[PDB]
Amino acid sequence: AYLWHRTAFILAYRTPVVPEGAKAGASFSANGVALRWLADYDYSQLGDRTLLDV
Amino acid sequence: AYLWHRTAFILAYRTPVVPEGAKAGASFSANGVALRWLADYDYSQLGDRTLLDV
Incomplete structure (x- = not known):
């Protein structure tokens, strides 16, 4: 069990930008x-590829 | 220094056609x-690629 103050632990977030x-x-x-959703079509394998990241 | 008549040197330019x-x-x-600029997202390397050419 952990007993901590709200300012004890830091979380840092930066949503990636969707490139052109x-x-x-x-x-x-x-x-x-806030996450970044990106979809790219893989013609070689005839399939769609998605990605959520932060 | 270089002194040349207009007919001495010839340049030929062509803008690549942006594909579909x-x-x-x-x-x-x-x-x-005129220069052709295109951008493609390499999902395999998680990176954008830009190309400006003629």
Whole structure:
């Protein structure tokens, strides 16, 4: 069990920017954290690829 | 120093045609020469790539 003050632990967040070369882009919130959604089509394997990141 | 008649040297320029797959297709100008600019997102390396050429 841990018993800590609100200012004991630091969390640092930075949502990545969607580059101009990304065919898709959006921003979703996970428990108050803005994420970056990116979709790229993989023609070689004939499949879509997604990515949420922070 | 170089002294040349107009017919001594010849340049030929051609702007590459932006294909139907390139996401970004802005076209720029350098010294009156039109340049092709395209951007593609390498998802395999998690990085953007930009190309400006002629």
